[PDB]
Design an enzyme around this catalytic site. Structure first.
Site, PDB file in Angstrom:
ATOM      1  N   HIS A  61      96.929  85.973 -22.890  1.00 42.26           N
ATOM      2  CA  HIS A  61      95.915  87.080 -23.360  1.00 42.26           C
ATOM      3  C   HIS A  61      95.510  87.466 -22.040  1.00 42.26           C
ATOM      4  CE1 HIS A  61      92.701  83.670 -23.703  1.00 42.26           C
ATOM      5  NE2 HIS A  61      92.125  84.827 -23.017  1.00 42.26           N
ATOM      6  N   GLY A  83      85.785  84.209 -19.349  1.00 40.05           N
ATOM      7  CA  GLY A  83      86.307  83.949 -17.917  1.00 40.05           C
ATOM      8  C   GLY A  83      86.888  82.704 -17.704  1.00 40.05           C
ATOM      9  N   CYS A 110      88.783  80.940 -19.876  1.00 33.66           N
ATOM     10  CA  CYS A 110      90.100  80.720 -20.380  1.00 33.66           C
ATOM     11  C   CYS A 110      91.349  80.180 -19.066  1.00 33.66           C
ATOM     12  CB  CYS A 110      90.798  81.924 -21.060  1.00 33.66           C
ATOM     13  SG  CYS A 110      90.094  81.948 -22.819  1.00 33.66           S
TER      14      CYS A 110
END
Ligand code: CL
Ligand code: CL
Lengths: 300, 300
Positions: free
Chosen positions: A40, A142, A144
């Protein structure tokens, strides 16, 4: 005298890089000449509700992936999507790559999380992979691509990559092949984790830890049977205890001289009667995020 | 969504060495060309009850101190005792020395502990320096010389070196100049820490953390005064809250729109009335080992 303890994080710190695609920035894991990160990263804020990842990816070339390791820009020479992670081939091997493996961890096992932002290590803490395949982490925007891991001597077993937050504030992610733990999907919807069942074997492990460390008020003169214990466990959404759980608890049982089924009798009364203000290892709740192996390792 | 979090430990892992004197082995901290370690490494099991450290040390020469960094033996070229730590001058500067400072930390502040055995990092966890100058660590035989630290950007501030266990299973140590925190002495007697007072400002900080993360059942329609709050705090062995505590809590108060004295009203009822089975950030007890700065840092 008994703490929630994470592994030392040095060997994993040297693997963290920043990955940016457009305005989206998260963390990647740089091992040999490959950077692993959540897919993503290719989504804009609009796309995150129902992304068509195959279609979004086809719009991206190697040069759209900005990979940075400290002050050094890495050169992306290939990319591919494997399940929910992206693999970015770079033209430099990470000199700090430790001995490593990827493992898909079982529900009930624990691992350390190195929370990261912008590719920079922020903090370390211990988690368990819960039976409903969530974890109780601490993650912000932020974070991930932060990873979870265990260390075995000098070998790092990577088991978790962070992707998302679930309705109750718990967390969901994938293994390093990009398959989610649990039924979750990387889309910005509300998704249910089912009932959060308690890891019975871990609670017993921790009660043994409490005895090792001098906390024994909850011991009683009773015992029980596996089948009778589980009749009570079920009502409290505890996992059923099996004979293999009993054998795994052998060493702690033996070290303390408390039969596993005697300890089950004590647990049974704690579940039905509560703690009436008392504490166990400094908690007023029953802790289920220590495995038997975790107790043994810390108490020796 | 809010966890007890330690700093990443990589920069400190590279400073840990093994120090042996006779049959006694513990950990040392290797910075530039000096290894810092607890002086009781020179004690045998007999001496630990009433050591005469000056007299024991006079019996030891440079070559009696076996300092090992992985497979490499370090050459000891000088030694001296500074308060309760030994400084072993070695003929090699540690190539992995980070930017560092020594600081004597205040009661109420937190730091990470890198528990070590035989000079090898074992695990990392967060502690607070309590008001009675103890800490609630997890330490076994062989863990002395493990250090506590904070990281500020890329600078490591070392604040704690581990020396001993106190009657209740809590822990005592020194700063890196070898002065104990608190009234403790490095001798194998039972020594008292006084009353373990609660760090009120940290409990308030954590209640704000709970609001940030959606836990708000304990908020009420009341407020109080500093003097009236402290009349209740005292009975529960809480630290008196001061105006400077109130100002330090400003940012969290402002971010949440809950005046500090409104939050004090909520705390007052939790102390007098208890939690009646409810939880706050997954605890059934009031947590005092997060500072205001720790909450801000984790929630941003
Ligand atoms: Cl009795
Ligand atoms: Cl109301």
């Amino acid at each position: 005298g008994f703490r929630k303890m994470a592994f030392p994080s040095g060997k994993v710190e040297g693997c963290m890089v920043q990955v940016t695609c457009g305005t989206t920035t998260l963390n990647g894991l740089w091992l040999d000449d490959v950077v692993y990160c959540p897919r993503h990263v290719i989504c804009t804020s609009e796309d995150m509700l129902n992304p068509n990842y195959e279609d979004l990816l086809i719009r991206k070339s190697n040069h759209n992936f900005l990979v940075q390791a400290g002050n050094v820009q890495l050169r992306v020479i290939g990319h591919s999507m494997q399940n929910c992670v992206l693999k970015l081939k770079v033209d430099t091997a990470n000199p700090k790559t430790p001995k490593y493996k990827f493992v898909r961890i079982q529900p009930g096992q624990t691992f350390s999380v190195l929370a990261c932002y912008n590719g920079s290590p922020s903090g370390v803490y211990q988690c368990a992979m819960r039976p409903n395949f969530t974890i109780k982490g601490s993650f912000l925007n932020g974070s991930c691509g932060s990873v979870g891991f265990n260390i075995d001597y000098d070998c790092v077993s990577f088991c978790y990559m962070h992707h998302m937050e679930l309705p109750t504030g718990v967390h969901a992610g994938t293994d390093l092949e990009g398959n989610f733990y649990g039924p979750f999907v990387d889309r910005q919807t509300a998704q249910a984790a089912g009932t959060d069942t308690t890891i019975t074997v871990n609670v017993l492990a921790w009660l043994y830890a409490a005895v090792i460390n001098g906390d024994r008020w909850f011991l009683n003169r009773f015992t029980t049977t596996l089948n009778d214990f589980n009749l009570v466990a079920m009502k409290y959404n505890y996992e059923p205890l099996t004979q293999d759980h009993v054998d795994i608890l052998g060493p702690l049982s033996a070290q303390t001289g408390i039969a596993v089924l005697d300890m089950c009798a004590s647990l049974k009364e704690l579940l039905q009667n509560g703690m009436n203000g008392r504490t166990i290892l400094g908690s007023a709740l029953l802790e289920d995020e220590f495995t038997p192996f975790d107790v043994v390792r810390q108490c020796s």
